[model samples]
Target: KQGPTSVAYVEVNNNSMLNVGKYTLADGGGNAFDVAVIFAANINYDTGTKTAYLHFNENVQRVLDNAVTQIRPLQQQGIKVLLSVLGNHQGAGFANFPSQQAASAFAKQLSDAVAKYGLDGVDFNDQYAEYGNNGTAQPNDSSFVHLVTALRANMPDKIISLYNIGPAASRLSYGGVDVSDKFDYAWNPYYGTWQVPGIALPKAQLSPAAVEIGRTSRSTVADLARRTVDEGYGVYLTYNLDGGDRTADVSAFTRELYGSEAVRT
Candidate 1:
């Protein structure tokens, strides 16, 4: 079931420590992954006005700017760059979007960021459990659907990636919302770490190529990427691009898994 192509992807959550120039370089670079997920652009909420704000910190913004410089080159090499977003502690998650207007406002922020940064798409990481109420109103499962709907309406051409969490991942296909159709890819976390049941959810709706399994081990990434290729499933690594030997570790892992496809500058 391996598709026509294979992909090596990675997620970088710490914007301050990430070196895009190194991650995208062909030689001596850890650019082994064909896709790099920038996790994330935070969603801040204002309780007084019940408004949602999407903004990046200085570190994240710096990385975003640097990433734009490499977008074309990465694209030329069949690489993709994505921006990830998550709800904040202030209680502005997609599940608690407050109202349709808040969801639309947040969606517009994401869409504009994707366009402004020339990113390939946006990835949604919904980990918050409680849909905190802002006195007047609160959000629910449908609120998530609404947010995704607005996002799709805004950036129909851009890729929509979802990290399979509890509520949204399980019910996205049903409920008349059909968020399953809105996403381009759905990523499942590693075994024993899954929040949702089954190896795949919203199953049979997404193409094999759109299903990706994430792991942190070097050997596992290699083993899984190669094994899943025939099935058209991709493999990704989830790790902070910080601390000692991270760059070397990633470079080695990329070279080991991608081999010839791991470009050498």
Candidate 2:
């Protein structure tokens, strides 16, 4: 229903939830962001058992534990709340799931989390896993595809997106289906880079321009936003939105995105 979607990755570590739902196009117009991703949950490893598991740090758990209060306001305004899973310097990560069964097991954990938290979906970022650190297998050719494939089976109705970087970016096919086909959307990982992912998706499912608010210069954000609009790309990503007033840092893109300035509610 929305045209190009905007994403805000809220850093739960240093930011307050007070501003999570405070941005929208104009005043109370359409929501400024289609997705609000809690940054983030972690993929931790078992030191004794050598297995990977989902671990929500205190901040993330605090947010989810208080989802009814903290996230409900964001959800009420048409923003889909997502839990972004990233690496934690552990030996296990999204790109190191040993088997399809392993991937499915983790996928079930994520699926259960979504059901339990009333969340909308999961976002996968492969970084800092430090794979092979403690005898864990290095990123295999099949691990990422297996994870996304199994994740697709587990959460058919929920959003699954890729932070197109690291090992998973190169492995995009398995079981005769493009793993990109399984993703609701995928975006460029690097700020200021406009490169598309290797998954061969249409413009509607890719955001090749990524921005980190207050850090990426306004001119670069402007250029990216114009390209995102002019080229018919369907997703625009912004990261590190905090509790302070962000209209000055973010509205440049929102102005081009919604054809109106963004306002803090």
Candidate 3:
């Protein structure tokens, strides 16, 4: 109940086509959420790498800012306002450029945005590697670590969090001596079709043991929490109040499975 809950963060992708967040919540669901850092590359292309530009168009930023303002009070009431930085696509992300100086500049801009806007820190969306990026190695990469390190050094404590991925936590090579000690919370979106039952398998690959174990272990929300704790990280289960088919069931199950502390309400 102290940390984040099953809030949905609507990704602001192409502005021309969607406004699903309000639509879902209008039906009385999907309470608190974290809007992803949807940059230009994610919209224009489908590359799975962190090579997108960060220049937010005025119209887009305005819509995003207005949404943030509307949700700030709710956020204070336990809603989490976070940005998903560094996408998992082949050629899309703010992790563009090879120079540390460029990376540092981008980081500073992000940090300043967080501080100035009075919102929570970033939630990295490191997925598969493409265009020279390696799978699971995204977070452990030195350049990525350097970016996080720079952000941590510049920003205050308890302001940065990395999205939970088995590799991000278990692999020392991703952030090693540079950034392992600075994470605030890790929210793993390993909820796709992959199976990571008992054993912690990298998102990209799940062994039979992991699948079988996950069949029984990660079957329920509570199991997910327990698994998260077992993985050496605090549990932050997303409330499935997204106003869909199983939203209500997931919502009730969230409370029953994870208990009071699991949800922020």
What is the C-alpha local distance difference test score of each model?
Answer: 0.57, 0.83, 0.42
lDDT tens digits, residue span 40-114, model 3:
212112236433344455654664577555435545444446555544444333333355564576677778766
Ranking by lDDT: 2, 1, 3
The local distance difference test score of model 1 is 0.57
TM-score of candidate 3 relative to the true fold: 0.57
Q: Which scores greater on TM-score, model 1 or model 3?
A: 1
Q: Write the per-residue lDDT of candidate 2 for residues 1-265, one digit (tens) a residue.
A: 2468888888888886547578767744687788898899999998798778999988889989898888888888778988899988888978787788888888889999999999999999888888888788888877788888888898899999989887777777766766878888898999876766656778888898899887899889878988898989989988898877888666788777777777786
* Inter-residue clash pairs, candidate 2: none
**lDDT at position 62, candidate 3:** 61
Q: Superposing all C-alpha atoms, what RMSD in Å does each candidate have to the true structure?
A: 5.3, 1.6, 8.3
Count residue pairs with overlapping backbones in model 3: 21
After superposing candidate 2, which stretches have Cα over 4 Å from the reference?
Answer: none
What is the Cα-based lDDT of residue 169 in candidate 3?
38
